[PDB]
């Protein structure tokens, strides 16, 4: 029951990740690798978890995905409406839970369930 979900996600792009331009670089993220990207995502995913910054604060600046202008959080969607490894993580956490560094087609993600 209840197919509708709400979640917040961050997206990091890296040199060669199909699209070498992040909202965090604006021009190109072709200088940062998947390692440097994980190095970065793991810090924001850390701070968001530790309480240094909120997902919103990190996402709006760092996330290359359109949710940068939304606060990282998305609206309501039907379970399975996202990406395979993305939704895999979303279902793997409840409200208030954040997922470990999950890579995707075009880069890196961390997601937390809002509802």
Fold observed for domain 1-115: Chitinase A; domain 3 (3.10.50)
The Cα–Cα gap between 104 and 10 comes to 11
Q: How many helices (H) and strands (E) does the chain have?
A: 3, 4
The experimental method behind these coordinates is NMR
Task: Give the three-class secondary structure for 58.
Answer: helix
Phi, psi of 40 (to 5 degrees): -90, -45
Among 94, 84, 70, smallest CA distance to 9 is for 70
Strand-by-strand arrangement of the 73-78 sheet: 73-78, 4-12, 108-113, 102-103
The Cα–Cα gap between 107 and 36 comes to 12
Q: Is 8 exposed, middle or buried (0-12, 13-18, 19+ CB in 10 A)?
A: buried
How distant is the alpha carbon of residue 45 from its chain centre? Answer: 9
CA within 13 Å, CB half, 42: 6
């Amino acid at each position: 029951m209840s197919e509708k979900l709400r979640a917040a996600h961050l997206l990091v792009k890296f040199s060669g990740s199909r699209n070498p331009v992040s909202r965090r670089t604006g021009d190109s993220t072709a200088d940062v690798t998947y390692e440097d990207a994980i190095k970065e995502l793991q810090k924001w995913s850390q701070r968001i978890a530790s309480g240094e910054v909120s997902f919103e604060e990190a996402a709006s600046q760092r996330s290359d995905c359109g949710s940068y202008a939304s606060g990282g959080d998305l609206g309501f969607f039907s379970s399975g409406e996202m990406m395979k490894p993305f939704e895999d993580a979303v279902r793997a956490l409840k409200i208030g839970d954040i997922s470990p560094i999950v890579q995707t087609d075009s880069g890196l993600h961390i997601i937390k369930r809002l509802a």
